[PDB]
Design a protein around this motif. Structure first.
Motif, PDB file in Angstrom:
ATOM      1  N   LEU A  68       0.769  -1.214   0.068  1.00  0.00           N
ATOM      2  CA  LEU A  68      -0.080  -0.021   0.072  1.00  0.00           C
ATOM      3  C   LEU A  68       0.904   1.131  -0.343  1.00  0.00           C
ATOM      4  O   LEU A  68       1.870   1.366   0.736  1.00  0.00           O
ATOM      5  N   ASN A  69       0.389   2.275  -0.591  1.00  0.00           N
ATOM      6  CA  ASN A  69       1.148   3.553  -1.190  1.00  0.00           C
ATOM      7  C   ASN A  69       2.461   2.968  -1.891  1.00  0.00           C
ATOM      8  O   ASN A  69       3.631   2.962  -1.269  1.00  0.00           O
ATOM      9  N   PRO A  70       2.272   2.404  -3.228  1.00  0.00           N
ATOM     10  CA  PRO A  70       3.631   2.001  -3.819  1.00  0.00           C
ATOM     11  C   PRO A  70       4.027   3.343  -4.489  1.00  0.00           C
ATOM     12  O   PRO A  70       3.550   4.194  -4.894  1.00  0.00           O
ATOM     13  N   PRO A  71       5.392   3.478  -4.808  1.00  0.00           N
ATOM     14  CA  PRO A  71       5.970   4.646  -5.387  1.00  0.00           C
ATOM     15  C   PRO A  71       5.960   4.602  -6.847  1.00  0.00           C
ATOM     16  O   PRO A  71       5.980   5.722  -7.540  1.00  0.00           O
ATOM     17  N   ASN A  72       5.692   3.517  -7.554  1.00  0.00           N
ATOM     18  CA  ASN A  72       5.444   3.577  -9.024  1.00  0.00           C
ATOM     19  C   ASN A  72       4.666   2.278  -9.291  1.00  0.00           C
ATOM     20  O   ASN A  72       4.942   1.052  -9.164  1.00  0.00           O
ATOM     21  N   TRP A  73       3.520   2.748 -10.117  1.00  0.00           N
ATOM     22  CA  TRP A  73       2.430   1.883 -10.233  1.00  0.00           C
ATOM     23  C   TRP A  73       2.824   1.218 -11.530  1.00  0.00           C
ATOM     24  O   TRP A  73       3.704   1.876 -12.641  1.00  0.00           O
ATOM     25  N   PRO A  74       2.206  -0.054 -12.053  1.00  0.00           N
ATOM     26  CA  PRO A  74       2.469  -0.756 -13.123  1.00  0.00           C
ATOM     27  C   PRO A  74       1.417  -0.158 -14.180  1.00  0.00           C
ATOM     28  O   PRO A  74       0.654   0.880 -13.809  1.00  0.00           O
ATOM     29  N   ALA A  75       1.780  -0.535 -15.163  1.00  0.00           N
ATOM     30  CA  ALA A  75       1.124   0.153 -16.409  1.00  0.00           C
ATOM     31  C   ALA A  75      -0.490  -0.536 -16.624  1.00  0.00           C
ATOM     32  O   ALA A  75      -1.388   0.227 -16.756  1.00  0.00           O
ATOM     33  N   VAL A  76      -0.741  -1.751 -16.025  1.00  0.00           N
ATOM     34  CA  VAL A  76      -1.913  -2.410 -16.179  1.00  0.00           C
ATOM     35  C   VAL A  76      -2.850  -2.004 -15.105  1.00  0.00           C
ATOM     36  O   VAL A  76      -4.139  -2.108 -15.455  1.00  0.00           O
ATOM     37  N   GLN A  77      -2.665  -1.597 -13.944  1.00  0.00           N
ATOM     38  CA  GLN A  77      -3.061  -1.230 -12.873  1.00  0.00           C
ATOM     39  C   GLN A  77      -3.695   0.303 -12.590  1.00  0.00           C
ATOM     40  O   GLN A  77      -4.354   0.699 -11.642  1.00  0.00           O
ATOM     41  N   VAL A  78      -3.370   1.035 -13.940  1.00  0.00           N
ATOM     42  CA  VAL A  78      -3.711   2.334 -13.984  1.00  0.00           C
ATOM     43  C   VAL A  78      -4.483   2.753 -15.199  1.00  0.00           C
ATOM     44  O   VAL A  78      -4.580   2.097 -16.252  1.00  0.00           O
ATOM     45  N   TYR A  79      -5.777   3.535 -14.862  1.00  0.00           N
ATOM     46  CA  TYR A  79      -6.873   3.681 -16.097  1.00  0.00           C
ATOM     47  C   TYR A  79      -6.176   4.425 -17.225  1.00  0.00           C
ATOM     48  O   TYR A  79      -5.401   5.334 -16.933  1.00  0.00           O
ATOM     49  N   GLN A  80      -6.246   3.858 -18.578  1.00  0.00           N
ATOM     50  CA  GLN A  80      -5.693   4.339 -19.550  1.00  0.00           C
ATOM     51  C   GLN A  80      -6.839   5.234 -20.443  1.00  0.00           C
ATOM     52  O   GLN A  80      -7.975   5.293 -19.640  1.00  0.00           O
ATOM     53  N   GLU A  81      -6.641   5.711 -21.490  1.00  0.00           N
ATOM     54  CA  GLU A  81      -7.360   6.392 -22.369  1.00  0.00           C
ATOM     55  C   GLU A  81      -7.305   5.808 -23.767  1.00  0.00           C
ATOM     56  O   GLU A  81      -6.538   6.359 -24.471  1.00  0.00           O
ATOM     57  N   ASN A  82      -8.230   5.093 -24.089  1.00  0.00           N
ATOM     58  CA  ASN A  82      -8.273   4.607 -25.453  1.00  0.00           C
ATOM     59  C   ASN A  82      -9.611   4.892 -26.139  1.00  0.00           C
ATOM     60  O   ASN A  82     -10.700   4.114 -26.212  1.00  0.00           O
ATOM     61  N   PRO A  83      -9.689   6.088 -26.809  1.00  0.00           N
ATOM     62  CA  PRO A  83     -10.735   6.568 -27.653  1.00  0.00           C
ATOM     63  C   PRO A  83     -10.720   5.706 -29.093  1.00  0.00           C
ATOM     64  O   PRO A  83     -10.125   5.014 -29.318  1.00  0.00           O
ATOM     65  N   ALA A  84     -11.766   6.345 -29.737  1.00  0.00           N
ATOM     66  CA  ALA A  84     -12.109   5.651 -30.998  1.00  0.00           C
ATOM     67  C   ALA A  84     -10.996   6.074 -31.792  1.00  0.00           C
ATOM     68  O   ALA A  84     -10.446   7.006 -31.869  1.00  0.00           O
ATOM     69  N   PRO A  85     -10.938   5.199 -32.929  1.00  0.00           N
ATOM     70  CA  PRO A  85      -9.640   5.696 -34.056  1.00  0.00           C
ATOM     71  C   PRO A  85     -10.112   6.794 -34.771  1.00  0.00           C
ATOM     72  O   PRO A  85     -11.192   6.711 -35.117  1.00  0.00           O
ATOM     73  N   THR A  86      -9.350   7.621 -35.015  1.00  0.00           N
ATOM     74  CA  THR A  86      -9.796   9.015 -35.360  1.00  0.00           C
ATOM     75  C   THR A  86      -9.992   8.891 -37.065  1.00  0.00           C
ATOM     76  O   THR A  86      -8.803   8.673 -37.609  1.00  0.00           O
ATOM     77  N   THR A  87     -11.102   8.819 -37.507  1.00  0.00           N
ATOM     78  CA  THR A  87     -11.642   8.740 -39.025  1.00  0.00           C
ATOM     79  C   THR A  87     -11.272  10.063 -39.638  1.00  0.00           C
ATOM     80  O   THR A  87     -12.055  10.837 -39.400  1.00  0.00           O
ATOM     81  N   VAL A  88     -10.304   9.997 -40.419  1.00  0.00           N
ATOM     82  CA  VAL A  88     -10.037  11.205 -41.057  1.00  0.00           C
ATOM     83  C   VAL A  88     -10.426  11.302 -42.574  1.00  0.00           C
ATOM     84  O   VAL A  88     -10.125  10.487 -43.299  1.00  0.00           O
TER      85      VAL A  88
END
Lengths: 180, 49
Positions: A68-88
């Protein structure tokens, strides 16, 4: 005292995103000192519910981790942001448009165009190239780090205590990086 | 004579208040940001000026 403890509430770090070291809850206490027996057994029956709600909330919500209280969180346990692929929508495909100018017609203005019948449009990835690590946001600290109800408090070996309750303690140095 | 304006206000008998709700509107004893999950589980120092 030891049995129904007032829970250690954390503090949020806005810069680093880590936990800023917890503290005793000192701003919600009832002033039961002016009360006889029929209420000081009721007030202790209230705190014994918020020390059981906070334990049936810590299982439903928080991520099961060791430090508890880790200094460096891993990649998978942090909420990412993956929106839709931008149709140009590409306006004018130049594979047959540079032939029109070389015929002699200068263009101006601007299907989509009358001289060419086709109109291709591409899509591309809108997420980051790598996912994010090292520090959780505000809403993750709303979700995790519920106030840790610490029963039989400070009752063991040195190092067996929660050393991150000290709001000065480096989690991977066993030491306050103080004035130096 | 040429002249430049100089306007202030005057208020007495009462004091300013800044409510803790989101739209700064009083919709109850408790507020919107008050009974948030934030600020009721966590602690936050403030550093006014």
């Amino acid at each position: 005292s030891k049995e129904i403890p007032t829970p250690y509430m954390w503090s949020y770090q806005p810069q680093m995103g880590l936990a800023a070291g917890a503290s005793q809850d000192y701003s919600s206490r009832m002033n039961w000192l002016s009360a006889g027996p029929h209420m000081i057994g009721r007030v202790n029956g209230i705190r014994a519910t918020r020390n059981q709600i906070l334990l049936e909330q810590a299982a439903l919500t928080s991520t099961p981790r060791s430090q508890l209280n880790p200094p460096n969180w891993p990649a998978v346990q942090v909420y990412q942001e993956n929106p839709a692929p931008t149709t140009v929508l590409l306006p004018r495909d130049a594979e047959a448009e540079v032939q029109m100018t070389n015929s002699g017609a200068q263009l101006a203005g601007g299907g989509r165009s009358s001289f060419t019948p086709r109109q291709a449009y591409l899509t591309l990835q809108s997420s980051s190239s790598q996912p994010r690590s090292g520090g959780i946001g505000t809403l993750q600290f709303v979700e995790e780090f519920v106030p840790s109800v610490y029963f039989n408090p400070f009752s063991g070996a040195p190092g067996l205590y929660p050393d991150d309750f000290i709001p000065n303690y480096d989690a991977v140095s066993e030491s306050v990086d103080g004035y130096d | 004579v040429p002249s430049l304006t100089q306007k202030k206000f005057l208020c007495d008998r009462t004091m300013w208040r800044i409510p803790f709700s989101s739209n700064f509107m009083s919709m109850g004893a408790l507020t919107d940001l008050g009974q948030n999950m934030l600020y009721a589980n966590s602690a936050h120092a403030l550093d006014m000026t």
